[PDB]
């Protein structure tokens, strides 16, 4: 199919959802093999853990703008290209791209890729930043800054900017939803 | 919208436009803020005035590539961090990057930031000087570095660095111009 961005804020439970969607189909959905210039590990196998490449070739292919997203992490780049999304399609799998609302924005500014977009929505702040302290780990600047960066998430929903919506109230209703969508290719 | 970095010799005029600008526009632009190891002083504001920190906070942000730029004063780090940039344009305003030379090939180096470059230039390098006097609060020697940072920012205005030059010989011609190339977003 087209690729699916599904995004959110954190503690959802957009992790179980794609969790169980990746384990009750395991052949049909992919995430980007992503690139990084960290020096490979033991253990990891190039084009497969990650598409290793160098400082210079990672830079190169920013200003190429190969890249749906990137960032740099302890001095090591990450990031998805283009490239790798297609090439999960090219598999005869479904992309999943789990990103934030400044990728989505990126994505849809390459209509060429033909996304679908998917939200899961709290059903409300107050649920999320509950749900957020029962996790347990984070204070409260953290947190703070997690239902403010969710409010505006959130606002970017209303503009109609998603193909679906799933506010998740519980997660098998969710679960059942988040696949009639995505089978549901159009 | 994009980060815009302006940029040109203090008494150009750049200051008026750039008043100017923002006299009509009051709604439209804004600064970023910025960071700092110093105590918040009698009656600071985190997050409003600056972004208070902690030294080694500070230091593993500039390590881990933070930082658009700092310095120390008296004892203390200050800087601007990229994060503070794009959360101008998060929240609805453009930014608006009043910079030097360096500033703005310190910003070319940080790709993720992707910003337009607009440079204020004086008629010749006479007007600069007699206006640099017309503001008469000077001296000889602070007259003459100026138009030696100046021959060497037009030198570099000359190497093409920005995606537009605005000479101001006329104040209503510059300033129809600076706003012609922000309203006129690439």
Not at 138 to 167: C, F, P, W
Request: charged share 30%; aromatic share 10%.
């Amino acid at each position: 199919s087209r690729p699916i961005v599904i995004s959110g804020p954190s503690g959802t439970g957009k992790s179980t959802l794609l969790k169980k969607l990746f384990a009750e189909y395991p052949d049909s959905f992919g995430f980007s093999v992503s690139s990084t210039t960290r020096t490979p590990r033991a253990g990891e196998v190039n084009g497969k853990d990650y598409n290793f490449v160098s400082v210079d070739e990672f830079k190169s292919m920013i200003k190429n703008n190969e890249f749906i997203e990137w960032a740099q992490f302890s001095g090591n780049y990450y990031g998805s290209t283009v490239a790798s999304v297609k090439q999960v399609s090219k598999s005869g799998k479904t992309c999943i791209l789990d990103i934030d609302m400044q990728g989505v924005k990126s994505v849809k500014a390459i209509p060429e890729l033909n996304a679908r977009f998917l939200f899961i929505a709290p059903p409300s702040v107050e649920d999320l930043k509950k749900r957020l302290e029962g996790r347990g780990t984070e204070t409260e600047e953290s947190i703070n800054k997690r239902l403010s960066a969710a409010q505006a998430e959130l606002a970017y929903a209303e503009t109609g900017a998603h193909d679906k919506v799933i506010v998740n109230d519980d997660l098998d209703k969710a679960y059942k939803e988040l696949k009639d969508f995505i089978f549901a290719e159009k």
